[PDB]
Design an enzyme around this catalytic site. Structure first.
Site, PDB file in Angstrom:
ATOM      1  N   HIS A 146       0.797  -1.228   0.000  1.00 33.77           N
ATOM      2  CA  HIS A 146       0.000   0.000   0.000  1.00 33.77           C
ATOM      3  C   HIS A 146       0.828   1.275   0.000  1.00 33.77           C
ATOM      4  CE1 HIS A 146       0.079   0.342   4.451  1.00 33.77           C
ATOM      5  NE2 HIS A 146      -0.153   1.627   4.243  1.00 33.77           N
ATOM      6  N   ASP A 160      -0.276  -7.614   1.533  1.00 34.16           N
ATOM      7  CA  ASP A 160       0.285  -6.266   1.473  1.00 34.16           C
ATOM      8  C   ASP A 160       1.801  -6.214   1.602  1.00 34.16           C
ATOM      9  OD1 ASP A 160      -0.275  -3.286   1.299  1.00 34.16           O
ATOM     10  OD2 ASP A 160       0.086  -3.253   3.450  1.00 34.16           O
ATOM     11  N   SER A 183       3.696   1.870   8.395  1.00 35.39           N
ATOM     12  CA  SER A 183       3.432   0.732   7.495  1.00 35.39           C
ATOM     13  C   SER A 183       4.691   0.225   6.807  1.00 35.39           C
ATOM     14  CB  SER A 183       2.424   1.046   6.409  1.00 35.39           C
ATOM     15  OG  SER A 183       1.177   1.098   7.147  1.00 35.39           O
TER      16      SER A 183
END
Ligand SMILES: *CC(=O)[C@H](CCCCN)NS(=O)(=O)c1ccc(C)cc1
EC number: 3.4.21.50
Length: 263
Positions: free
Chosen positions: A57, A113, A194
């Site tokens: 992402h 992801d 992230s």
């Protein structure tokens, strides 16, 4: 940089016994702007290839965006700021001068992801890097350790002393992600974190941060996050450009887990 005061500087005592893995983590920018976290992983050939695991992402899974990367190593507060105090929530004194730029995409996959990049430049001894081990076993752990750059600010460490569980992205029934519960007044994760690794108590990567509900003010089960599992990413999308196996076990040892390698 600035992040939630509940976070913990890597130089604090919480980093004791983890001074190796701390050195595997870097923060990075995408097309000029600060974006996420990534970290180096070892492979069965023990060759120090610059395999940098991050989150899909964050959007570095393309030739053109992966080329754009700027990695910042050793970006952390010089001194331990007491967590849950205003000093922790204040602007840090981290240096962003140890950098490297450019990379190529090895693989990327949306479900778990993950994105595996290979940094263009070979390890610079001056950076004192560490290549972490990994564990692809299909199991849960009694606790976990997160090393990340919240808000893409100074490096932090978050401890989990609760067992992990399997979930789907969003927390529903599934096995692609690991659910990690943070300590009630402990560090958490934030946007920018992230792609940061989650390590087992034995210091091996089990996945990387997808996201979740946590923030320093979160209470109960909302003070948790979800990590796309290395187990899932191992087979990933069904081919080398969407999985980790080809890259992490080039020597075909069939290993279920491996330790790290120092600079
Ligand atoms: C990508 C990243 O910075 C965040 C981490 C948030 C951690 C909060 N405890 N992931 S996200 O969950 O914010 C997210 C953003 C965009 C997309 C499409 C997926 C998830």
């Amino acid at each position: 940089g600035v992040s939630g005061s509940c976070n913990i500087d890597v130089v604090c005592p919480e980093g004791d016994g983890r001074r190796d893995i701390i050195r595997a983590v870097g923060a990075y920018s995408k097309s000029g702007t600060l974006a996420c976290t990534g970290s180096l992983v070892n492979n069965t050939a023990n060759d120090r290839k610059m395999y940098f695991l991050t989150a899909h992402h964050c959007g570095m899974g393309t030739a053109s965006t992966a080329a754009s990367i700027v990695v910042y190593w050793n970006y952390q507060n010089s001194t331990c700021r007491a967590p849950n105090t205003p000093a922790s929530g204040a602007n840090g004194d981290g240096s962003m001068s140890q950098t490297q730029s450019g990379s190529t995409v090895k693989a990327t996959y949306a479900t778990s992801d993950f994105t595996l990049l290979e940094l263009n430049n070979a390890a610079n001894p001056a950076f004192n890097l560490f290549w972490a081990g990994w564990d692809r076993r299909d199991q849960n752990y009694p606790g976990a350790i997160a090393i990340h750059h919240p808000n893409v600010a100074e490096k932090r460490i978050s401890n989990s002393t609760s067992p992990t569980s399997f979930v789907a992205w969003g927390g529903g029934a599934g096995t692609t992600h690991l659910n990690v519960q943070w300590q009630p007044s402990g560090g958490v994760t934030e946007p920018g974190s992230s792609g940061s690794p989650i390590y087992s108590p034995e210091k091996r990567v089990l996945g990387q941060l997808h996201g979740g509900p946590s923030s320093c003010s979160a209470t109960g089960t909302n003070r948790s996050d979800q990590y796309g599992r290395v187990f899932t990413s191992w087979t990933g999308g069904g081919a080398a450009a969407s999985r980790l196996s080809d890259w992490l076990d080039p020597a075909s040892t069939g290993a279920q887990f491996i330790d790290g390698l120092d600079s």
